[model samples]
Target: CASKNERCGNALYGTKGPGCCNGKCICRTVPRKGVNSCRCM
Candidate 1:
């Protein structure tokens, strides 16, 4: 599984489920964001 704070690779406003290739794409919406990629936890 991917470690914490590792540069990696979300949807919906409320009715959304978990995400990520490793099932660890849980995020808290950081200050920074990408245009092509929406950075996640």
Candidate 2:
């Protein structure tokens, strides 16, 4: 996880998430977004 104020990664636009992997944010988005019921794309 990002140590307070840490960046999440390119996925999160340099924002922090619940965890990180190789400088990448591996966190899920809120309001649920993507190819699912939460998404309409």
Candidate 3:
């Protein structure tokens, strides 16, 4: 995995993130629509 405020991984499962992680940067499965690869904070 990566870090928070940035991309943890890239594409399809833990490889595909739920958008963004807090500070933990854990790739947890989530359901979303109309989202893009920019969930940083």
Candidate 4:
């Protein structure tokens, strides 16, 4: 059950709820509204 952008794997940074990129875990933050969920690459 993917399809937001594909590539789902290794979402274990903190291991909580939907905080890890549900579309896939290639280091994701995916938060909006004020736009600054904090991300690093």
Candidate 5:
């Protein structure tokens, strides 16, 4: 599942939910996206 979150083991530390795209988890720069990785605060 491309949209499924499989990084719930904390092995990746911050997944932003899942779906690692450029080997960096595609950490977004917005808080509305997810606080798991990208956070505007």
Candidate 6:
């Protein structure tokens, strides 16, 4: 799942939660169409 407002996991993705985890690559979240996760700028 994607976090509401927090730094993504170790990978480039995360879900509505807290703390750190693993996924694809360090990341962040956003509100858009056809989107899920990506590295924060």
Best by TM-score: 3
Model 4 over residues 1-41: C-alpha lDDT tens digits?
Answer: 33454433333554232322443334455545522232322
Q: List the candidates' TM-scores in order.
A: 0.22, 0.21, 0.24, 0.20, 0.20, 0.19
Give the residue spans of candidate 2 off by over 4 A: 9-41
Query: Which scores better on lDDT, 2 or 4?
Result: 4
Please give, for residues 1-41, the per-residue lDDT of candidate 6 as tens digits.
33334344442243443443334334434575425544322
**What are the per-residue Cα lDDT tens digits for candidate 1 across 1-41?**
34443434445433244344453554445447633332345
Model 2 Cα lDDT, one tens digit per residue, 1-41: 44433434333334323443334333335564522111111
Residue lDDT tens for model 5, 9-41: 234454434343333333333568655553211
For candidate 5, the 10 contiguous residues with the lowest summed lDDT are: 1-10
Error of 5 at 10 (Å): 2.3
Clashes of 3: 1
Candidate 3 lDDT over 1-30, as tens digits, reads: 344567555464426554544554433444
CA lDDT, every model vs. true structure: 0.41, 0.35, 0.47, 0.37, 0.37, 0.39
- CA deviation > 4 Å runs, candidate 1: 1-9, 13-19, 30-41
Per-residue error for 5 in candidate 1, Å, reads 5.4
lDDT pick, better of 2 and 3: 3
| 26: Cα error in model 6, Å | 2.9
Candidate 4 overall Cα lDDT vs. reference?
A: 0.37
How far is 24's C-alpha from truth in model 3 (Å)? 3.1
**Least accurate stretch of 10 residues (summed lDDT) in model 2?**
32-41
